């Protein structure tokens, strides 16, 4: 899910998420049996990452850790 949503929004190689962050997205932002809501939340992270890139810039990976999740 996350490689697809990163590739599909042009932010490939510029942003990355950790495992603690994915676990927090599953436990606190989703109540489902399937997996579509998780895909929508990770897609939201990628869109906002593109928005932040297009007005500033950085170099290398920005790593989103588990305490950066409420920012996005």
């Amino acid at each position: 899910l996350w490689p697809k949503q990163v590739r599909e929004s042009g932010m490939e190689g510029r942003i990355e998420v950790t495992d603690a962050a994915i676990l927090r997205v599953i436990s606190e932002y989703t109540r489902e049996a399937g997996v579509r809501g998780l895909e929508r939340e990770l897609g939201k992270i990628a869109r906002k990452g593109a928005k932040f890139w297009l007005e500033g810039a950085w170099e290398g990976l920005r790593t989103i850790d588990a305490s950066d999740i409420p920012t996005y």
Binding site: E32, A33, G34, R36
Partner: protein, 72 residues
């Protein structure tokens, strides 16, 4: 007559496959889901074991039941 000569009457593509190649192709599109993949591999085992014989060939009929987001 144009409908009657264009539906396929006895024209088929092969059914005896390498098992492990099918296993690797199934495992690169979906995570988990062991019951469905084992059903497919048991079908191909029966197809390999029966190719010399002359018995009734009958393809399966399945229903996949589940919640709204799982990979049906």
């Amino acid at each position: 007559l144009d409908w009657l000569t264009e539906v396929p009457w006895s024209k088929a593509d092969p059914e005896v496959l390498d098992i492990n190649h099918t296993r690797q192709v199934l495992d690169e599109d979906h995570y988990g889901l062991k019951d469905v993949k084992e059903r497919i591999l048991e079908y191909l085992a029966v197809r390999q074991l029966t190719q010399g014989l002359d018995v009734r060939n009958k393809a399966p009929i399945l229903v996949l039941v589940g919640p709204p987001g799982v990979g049906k």
